[PDB]
Amino acid sequence: STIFPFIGVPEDYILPKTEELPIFREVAWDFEKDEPILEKGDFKIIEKKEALKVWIYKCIKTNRYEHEIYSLEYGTELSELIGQKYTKGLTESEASRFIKEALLINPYILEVNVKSANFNRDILSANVKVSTIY
């Protein structure tokens, strides 16, 4: 509480720690049945990339302003595109922006890219690449 590190730190002084995030861990989830997974009569815990997959799935699957429990940041506005309310190019731009802005609130996710986009009948397809710290 004595040092003044704003101009420079003293040579003898040791920095307490380097700031890093803990290992991301989450209750495992199965996607074809939409349930948590029980292992030996208890919830099964996964870590790192699989936990991030679970979180991403949950974030994409929710609507933005629908629920009172969530804040204004959590969710996705992809439900406003159903029915071709906008033109096709505007729909592509909006979808890309929506997905990027929704995913980038997690501190463990570094960059999101929506590369491909195709229109076939009433289906819109896209490829999303997520880069994490791991």
Closest distance to other proteins from the beta carbon of 62 (Å): 5
The answer to the question of residue 134 lying near other proteins (CB under 8 A) is: no
Task: Name the one range near other proteins by CB under 8 A: 14-22, 55-63, 84-92, 102-110.
Answer: 55-63
Binding to other proteins (CB under 8 A) within 110-129 occurs at: 129
Query: For the residues of 61-102, what is the DSSP string, one character each?
Result: HSBSSS-SSS-SSSSB-GGGSTTT-S-HHHHHHHHHHHHHHH
Interface with other proteins by CB under 8 A: which range of 4-12, 16-24, 26-34, 104-112? 26-34
| SS3 readout for 100-126 | HHHHCCCCCEEEEEEEEEEEECCEEEE
Is 88 one of the binding residues for other proteins (CB under 8 A)? no
Interacting residues toward other proteins by CB under 8 A: 31, 33-36, 53, 57-58, 60-63, 66-69, 78, 82, 129
